[PDB]
Amino acid sequence: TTTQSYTNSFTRGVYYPDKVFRSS
Amino acid sequence: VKNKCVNFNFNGLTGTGVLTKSNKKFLPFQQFGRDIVDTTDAVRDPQT
Ligand SMILES: *[C@@H]1O[C@H](CO)[C@@H](O)[C@H](O)[C@H]1NC(C)=O
Asked: What effect is documented for mutating residue 14 to K (chain B)?
């Protein structure tokens, strides 16, 4: 069995779009 | 050759300039470099 409760993701789930180094 | 004006063809990335050692913190998946105006800055050597 399983449940389908709903929660908030907050600020989460951001990856690096590219493979390009960046600073400041 | 480093510290000398050379035409580079790094993995198909053509250009001109001077290269040297760096202390960047490239993540293992990182391959290229750039700046805030999107100009290629650092290239990871494919054979080093
Ligand atoms: C490149 O290939 C040579 C020959 O197998 C090997 O000795 C060397 O460690 C390799 N270097 C890299 C960075 O893969």
From this structure: In strain: Omicron/BA.1
Resolution for this PDB entry, in angstroms: 3.3
Helix, strand and coil content of chain B, in percent to the nearest 5, comes to 0, 25, 75
Query: Tokens 């004006």 label which residue?
Result: B5
| Distance in angstroms (rounded) separating the CA atoms of residues B30 and B10 | 15
Nearest residue on chain B to A21, alpha-carbon basis: B33
Q: Which technique was the structure solved with, according to the deposited record?
A: cryo-EM
Range list of H helices, B1-48: none
- A11 vs A6: CA distance, rounded Å: 16
Quick check: B30 and B21 in contact, CB under 8 A?
no
Residue of A nearest to B37 (CA): A22
